[PDB]
Amino acid sequence: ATDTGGYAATAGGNVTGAVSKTATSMQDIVNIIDAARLDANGKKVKGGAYPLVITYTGNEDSLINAAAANICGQWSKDPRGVEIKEFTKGITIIGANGSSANFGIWIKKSSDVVVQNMRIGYLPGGAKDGDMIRVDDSPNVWVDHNELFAANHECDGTPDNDTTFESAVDIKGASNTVTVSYNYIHGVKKVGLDGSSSSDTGRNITYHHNYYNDVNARLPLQRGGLVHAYNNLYTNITGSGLNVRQNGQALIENNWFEKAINPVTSRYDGKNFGTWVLKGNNITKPADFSTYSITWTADTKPYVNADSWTSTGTFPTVAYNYSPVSAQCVKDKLPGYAGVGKNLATLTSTAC
């Protein structure tokens, strides 16, 4: 099936003729993809020779645990990541239960890529683009059921005072359709952008069933296009949540917000504010701010906060088929479906 519950329509490497391989380390993954580019005669095939399903059984807890004990020593180390560049035959990277990685997955100019059940945390190289997951010029990508974490903290003396750790899921370029679902993102200062600059506007992204906890900002930092965020659990947001910019449009439905500062805003540009359609969230009116500990702040430049909690624009017909659960149900159940080791389980109404 190609249904991801969002804009991305892909099965990744789970197609006809897929070759399954087991990777026990980051290097194995690199070698497997390289080999996957060669045809029967040893010649390279543009976009890849065959579809792949790579099961990653490696474990780097030692690296992660060492890093967690010395947070400020990570930004200056070499970044570590597997680059999936120009591979379009279809590929899925599934972590085995118990597997872990102290390296990121960088997708560049590829298509039909699915990343699931990977536990990635405390990556080194925040000063040199050490992102956990990067989707660049890559349409039909599905980032599902992963645990992305670090420390929601900024060490002193880091270059730009923003490089202690890099992003969890940055999306940029022509990654026209992307679905980010069932991820447990925690302890991340900059979760992920949707457009790397003011000119990098566009794309149709869906964020559904994600559990965010102790994050500072960018859920996402949207530049143009459309974003459909539904059934996400937003708790302990220390800076700002969805920042809808450059005239982007967002449909924010049936989510649960709690202990969040500026959960829905449009700030930092001073102009071209985006719009949002609010519906079915735990917060229905301003009276609820106090109940769920939702605070608001101003910005030095013109900005717009959803402090009136009203829709400020419209949203096109949601192309795909999805069935949202209630905000209460996500609050109650989501933590047991999002993340690694949940066997890619989905939250249905029957479980509410």
Side-chain angles (χ1 to χ4, degrees):
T2 53
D3 182 73
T4 68
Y7 291 109
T10 194
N14 283 282
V15 288
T16 291
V19 175
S20 294
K21 298 284 189 188
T22 297
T24 58
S25 59
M26 175 185 60
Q27 196 52 35
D28 277 13
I29 302 179
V30 179
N31 296 147
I32 291 168
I33 297 175
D34 250 314
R37 301 190 184 268
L38 305 168
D39 68 13
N41 300 312
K43 269 69 188 298
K44 287 188 183 177
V45 178
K46 180 193 170 60
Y50 52 84
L52 265 175
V53 178
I54 302 173
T55 292
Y56 170 76
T57 64
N59 182 292
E60 304 192 320
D61 289 347
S62 312
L63 261 10
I64 296 168
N65 295 337
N70 186 33
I71 273 158
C72 301
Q74 292 302 93
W75 66 266
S76 58
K77 301 186 184 180
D78 295 346
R80 297 218 297 144
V82 171
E83 189 165 341
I84 306 183
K85 190 191 171 223
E86 297 177 86
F87 198 93
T88 58
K89 284 294 177 304
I91 176 173
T92 297
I93 295 185
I94 339 167
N97 287 315
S99 69
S100 69
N102 187 232
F103 63 84
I105 305 294
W106 306 329
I107 308 153
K108 174 58 177 172
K109 304 179 82 176
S110 294
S111 301
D112 301 285
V113 182
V114 176
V115 176
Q116 301 181 286
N117 209 56
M118 295 288 289
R119 186 176 109 97
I120 302 170
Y122 295 95
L123 301 206
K128 308 180 185 82
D129 305 313
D131 298 306
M132 301 192 233
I133 294 183
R134 185 160 67 222
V135 184
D136 191 355
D137 288 319
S138 304
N140 279 325
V141 170
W142 187 22
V143 182
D144 178 79
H145 276 99
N146 304 292
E147 184 183 343
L148 286 357
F149 60 111
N152 182 7
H153 174 81
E154 189 67 50
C155 302
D156 296 319
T158 56
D160 285 307
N161 280 282
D162 205 25
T163 50
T164 291
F165 286 108
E166 264 298 340
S167 310
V169 191
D170 266 5
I171 296 167
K172 50 163 158 287
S175 307
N176 297 151
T177 51
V178 181
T179 298
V180 183
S181 53
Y182 290 95
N183 301 289
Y184 178 20
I185 304 179
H186 57 101
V188 178
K189 185 184 174 194
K190 300 173 302 169
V191 176
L193 41 69
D194 170 15
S196 51
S197 55
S198 308
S199 41
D200 192 25
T201 56
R203 299 165 302 272
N204 295 158
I205 323 301
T206 303
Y207 295 83
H208 76 88
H209 295 91
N210 296 294
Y211 177 15
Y212 304 93
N213 176 47
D214 189 16
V215 296
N216 194 69
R218 313 188 174 183
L219 322 182
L221 179 168
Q222 166 185 6
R223 290 190 250 236
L226 309 178
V227 163
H228 181 197
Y230 74 88
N231 281 172
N232 297 294
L233 213 198
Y234 302 98
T235 56
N236 295 292
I237 297 181
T238 62
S240 60
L242 295 89
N243 193 349
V244 191
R245 299 150 70 166
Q246 296 304 319
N247 301 125
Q249 291 172 277
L251 171 52
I252 306 170
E253 71 171 297
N254 294 34
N255 299 290
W256 182 285
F257 297 86
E258 185 160 31
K259 299 177 191 300
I261 300 174
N262 302 323
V264 179
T265 181
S266 188
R267 56 177 60 205
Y268 308 141
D269 289 332
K271 63 171 182 301
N272 302 323
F273 307 113
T275 63
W276 45 80
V277 172
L278 301 162
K279 64 157 73 77
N281 303 294
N282 60 318
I283 293 176
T284 48
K285 57 174 70 179
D288 304 321
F289 295 164
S290 58
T291 308
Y292 306 115
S293 307
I294 302 299
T295 52
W296 301 93
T297 67
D299 181 56
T300 60
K301 285 184 181 184
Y303 60 96
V304 179
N305 279 340
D307 48 15
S308 300
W309 207 259
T310 54
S311 296
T312 59
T314 58
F315 200 85
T317 305
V318 172
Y320 50 95
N321 199 255
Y322 65 113
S323 207
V325 109
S326 79
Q328 243 303 153
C329 185
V330 327
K331 167 59 176 183
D332 294 329
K333 301 293 184 297
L334 193 58
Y337 290 77
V340 303
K342 306 305 191 309
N343 284 300
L344 314 189
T346 48
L347 182 56
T348 330
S349 309
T350 60
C352 295

